[PDB]
Each structure stands twice: as C-alpha cells, then as structure tokens.
Amino acid sequence: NNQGSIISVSLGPGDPGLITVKALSQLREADVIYYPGTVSASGAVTSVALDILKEFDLDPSKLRGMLVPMSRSRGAAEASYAANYASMAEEVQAGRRVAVVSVGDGGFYSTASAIIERARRDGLDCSMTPGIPAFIAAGSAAGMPLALQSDSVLVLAQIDEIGELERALVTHSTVVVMKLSTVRDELVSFLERYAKPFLYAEKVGMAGEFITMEVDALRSRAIPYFSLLVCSPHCRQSTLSPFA
Amino acid sequence: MNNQGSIISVSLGPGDPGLITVKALSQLREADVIYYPGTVSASGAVTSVALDILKEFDLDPSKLRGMLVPMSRSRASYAANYASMAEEVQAGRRVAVVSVGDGGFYSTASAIIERARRDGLDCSMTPGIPAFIAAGSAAGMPLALQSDSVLVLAQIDEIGELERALVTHSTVVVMKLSTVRDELVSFLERYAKPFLYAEKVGMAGEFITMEVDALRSRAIPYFSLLVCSPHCRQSTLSPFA
C-alpha cells in the first residue's frame, strides 16, 4: 500500500530483470510513481522508464509521467521535475508513499537529485535506492571488464565537442562517454581517427538494444539519447572483438 | 544427459542483499554450484564479503565453494579454481561465480571469465551495483549532475595519486582505501572539503561518515572507499559545522 514518503527509486538501466529486489518492492508498495518521458510533435510518448515500469504489473493508475521534448537547457528535465514537485509534496502531505524513478542509477546523472534537494530542505522523509548505471550494464552485455587492477575510469556525460573525449583519452585507462546524441554528427570520424578498441552501446537490456565495436556499423546510424561509448583496451576481451 | 553445463559470472551487488538484481538472485537459486571469493590470513582466519552476502539469501550451503586465496603469493596464484569449475561444467552442471559489487568493475571474476573464455565456454556476465554508487545513495547525495565528470581510482599505492587527481578533477572516488590507511586522516585535514567515507555499506556494521573526527581511531579495512566531491555537501551527514 505504502511505506516511505518521497523515494528516489533506481530502475536499473533497461532490462527489468536488473532492477534490485529492494527497488522492485518499493515500487509495488508506492502510492504514486513519477517517471520521465519525452513527447514528439503529435502525442506519442517515448519513455524508457515507462517501458520498464510496464514489466512490473503495477496499477497503471498510480503512474505520473513528467513530459519533455528533446531539449538541452541543463536538460529541460530540471524545469519539468521542478514543476512536478508541488504535486509530489501534496501527495506526501496526504500521507502517501511517492516514488520518483530513474533509468540506471538515481544518483548518477539523474534529474531525481532535484527532487531530493527539495524533499530534504522541506524536511520530508526521503530516500535513495540505487540502480546499475548504463555503462556498467554495457560492459557486462559485451562480455568485457571495464576496470582491472590499477585501472582508472573516467566517466563523462553530454560531451560538448568531440575534442573533449580526444584530450581525456591518453591520461586515462578507460573513458566512458554518456548521452552520445550531443556528438552524433562527430562520432564516426572520431572513431576512425581513434583507431583503437571501443564499445558503442545503445538501449542495453531494452527492446532496441544495439552494441557494436565496428565503426562501419555506425556510419549511417542515428545516434540517440540513450547511447554511450566505452573507449578502453579491455574492449579486446569482448565477445564482439575478433581477438576473442 | 550432460550436454549443457554452463558458467555465469553473477554480480552480488555492494552488500545489502536487497541490492542484488532480481535476475542475479534467480541465477544463484538455479545454479548447481556457486564459487565465491575470499581471503585467508596466516593464522587461517577467512575474510569474505562475498560469502557474507550469500549467507543472506537462503541458498543451499552445500552448493557453496570457497575460492580462498592467501593474502600472500600474488598473481594468490590460484586461478586453479577453474579446472574445478570446468569439471562441474563437464559434468553437465550450472556454475555461478560470484563478485562483490559488479563482476566487471575491479573484480575478482575477470581472470576466471577470461580462463573460461580461452577455453570453449560461454560465460555470460550479470551486472551488479558498484560499491561507490551504493555509498552515494546511502549518504543521500548524487555522485554526478549535468556534464560533471567522475574519476574512479582503486588500490592506490600512495596518497599523492589522489591529491594530484583532485587538482584537475572535482569528483574522485578511491576504492580499496586500505592501501592508503596511514595517510587518510592527514590527507582529509589538508583537503578541508566535503568527502564521504564508507565502509560495509548496506551490511551489518555499515559505517559512513563525512566527519574527519570519526576516522581518527577507526581501522580502515579493505572494503572501504572514499568519495571526494562538492556533491557531498548535499547529505544530512555533511558537517553541521
């Protein structure tokens, strides 16, 4: 029926089997669940978060979409989440158990952190249940390690110019770049230039999963928001590598 | 029949048995045999966070097989747990090899997976939540926002590694803080900025702090990490001072 007041519930990165035992139980006991999604020109919502929730046989009545276009004002998501907080607060006032869900982990580049600021300063009971980051899941779906003994790992997100990844590469073991859409027109020439093992992973664990280590397989590919890149020598270990 | 016989690298997550994925837990319950890592001191005392997590799931205890490695002969030198696995696999059996955290992220399992894979075996990987991700959520802080970077180090030799990295990176996580235990308090005094220290997150004896004074007498164990980040001031733990 309920338990907490405001909970940031990580869904994991797309495969519903990769939610935690705890996150899943929190969802089933929540009174209301807010999820992010995007809308196209017509209606037609796209929401990876909702696609995941739909696998849990939850009461479709308790679900509250927070909807945006495709935008980059520190992700119009911040305003969208901000705008939605009032209702979440009133639900919490009504004595309800509110979940705000995140693809991957709620504390790792998630706008849910805006809800947990406000929740904590308005003195409400709030919590974070963590989830598997997308880059962790990508490494495992490719059958490779991301980090071994003495490695460093640098994680970047919303890369500005492709030159930012280029500079980082040499001073770091593995580099991970999230949200590749922001360099969708620069990715392929970067990859030809780099000429070193990489993992491209899109929609991992989800219906349209696509993972590749071949530049040719990306030449005429649309690079969407939910996609990431791993540049690392360890990519040689993957099942997707000729090196075995 | 024996023509099956598989091996899976199953991540356990960071410590709280509630932070196992639904899928990894199902795989452990289905497995015929479950190998877990652990270490053994000279007086023969066994330390194994992995077995401590397994002990929380109601598994058949006769299914569990320790892969214990002396804290000594570094490769240790005991990859010879695999021939055992292969045999079980040869015998038609479902073998799980487990990892604390994620099995691809500074893990004990990678060297086993590579051996399986040099051999003809399929060894899929089920992911888990790394300890540093769990530590952030336990403290109620985010680890990264909009265009932030995250740098992860582990088993660092010397405290300078960290100091140096923090000149040019805002958020730096260091895993296996034991390696710099003698230097931690002094480092944190001169650092004089928000930090999160976390030990046994999600388990009995969880200890997390953003107070240097809570560390002055503390035994900093091997499964210990530090996060240095301004994001630490976004926790009810960040010094009321």
CATH of the domain at A23: 3.40.1010.10
Find chain A residues with C-beta within 8 A of B20's C-beta: 20-21
- Given A101, A132, A163, the domain boundary residue is A132
Is there a single domain that holds both residue A43 and residue A119?
yes
Nearest-Cα residue of chain A relative to residue B134: A130
For residue A145, the chain B residue with the least C-alpha distance is: B104
CB B53 within 8 A of CB B25: no
Mutation site for A-interface testing, chosen from B30, B112, B150, B227 by largest number of A Cβ within 10 Å = B150
> How close is the nearest chain A Cα to the Cα of B106, in Å?
5
Cross-chain residue pair A136–B105, CB shorter than 8 Å:
yes
Domain shared by B21 and B108, yes or no? yes
Note whether A199 and A88 are same-domain residues: no
Residues in chain A within 8 Å Cβ distance of B105: 136, 139, 145-147
Q: Please tell me what DSSP assigns to residue A43.
A: S
Domain boundaries, position B78: 1-129
Residue pointed to by tokens 């020109």: A41
**Does the annotation flag B122 for ligand binding?**
no
Q: Does A151 sit within 8 Å of B127, measured CB to CB?
A: no
A5 and A113 share a domain? yes
Q: Are A64 and A35 in contact (CB under 8 A)?
A: yes
Number of domains in chain B: 2
Q: Of B129, B160, B181, which residue sits at a domain end? A: B129
Cβ contact, residue pair B137, A157, below 8 Å? no
Please report, for the domain that includes residue A137, its CATH number: 3.30.950.10
Binding site membership of A: which residues?
13, 105, 134, 178-179, 204, 225, 227
Q: Which of B26, B104, B146 sits opposite A139 (nearest CB)?
A: B104
A104 and A138 in a single domain? The answer is no
The DSSP element (H or E) to which A34 belongs, if any, is strand A32-39
Contacts of A127 in chain B (CB under 8 A): 140
How deeply is B51 buried, as exposed, middle or buried, from its count of CB atoms within 10 A (0-12, 13-18, 19+)? middle
> By the 8 A CB rule, do B38 and B127 touch?
no
Clarify whether residues B212 and B189 are in a common domain: yes
Q: Do B146 and A152 touch (CB under 8 A)?
A: no
Task: Please name the residues in contact with B227: beta carbons below 8 A apart, sequence gap of 6 or more.
Answer: B132, B135, B136, B143, B171, B172, B173, B195, B196, B198
The reply to whether B158 and B117 lie within a common domain is no
B46: β partners: B40
A84 residue type, one letter:
N
CB pairs below 8 Å between A and B: how many? 164
Residues of chain B contacting A126 with CB distance shorter than 8 Å: 140
Structure token pair of residue A50? 């909702």
- Pairing state between β A126-129 and A153-157: unpaired
Residues A8 and A108 in one domain: yes
Please tell me which residue of chain B has the smallest CA distance to A235.
Answer: B104
Instruction: Identify the experimental approach.
Output: X-ray
Looking at the fold, whether B166 and B234 belong to one and the same domain comes out as yes
A126 with A156, same domain?
no
Query: Of A132, A165, A186, which marks where a domain is finished?
Result: A132
User: What is the 3-class SS of A217-235, one letter each residue?
Assistant: HHCCCCCCCCEEEEECHHH
DSSP state for residue A61 in the 8-state scheme: G
In this structure, which amino acid lies at residue B216?
R
The rounded distance, in Å, linking the Cα atoms of B156 and A200 is 29
Do A164 and A121 fall into the same domain? no
Smallest CA–CA separation between B90 and chain A, in Å?
22
Tell whether A12 and A86 lie within a shared domain. yes
CA distance A127 to chain B (A): 7
Strand boundaries in A63-145, DSSP class E: 63-68, 98-102, 126-129
CB < 8 Å to B104, chain A: 136, 139-140, 144-147
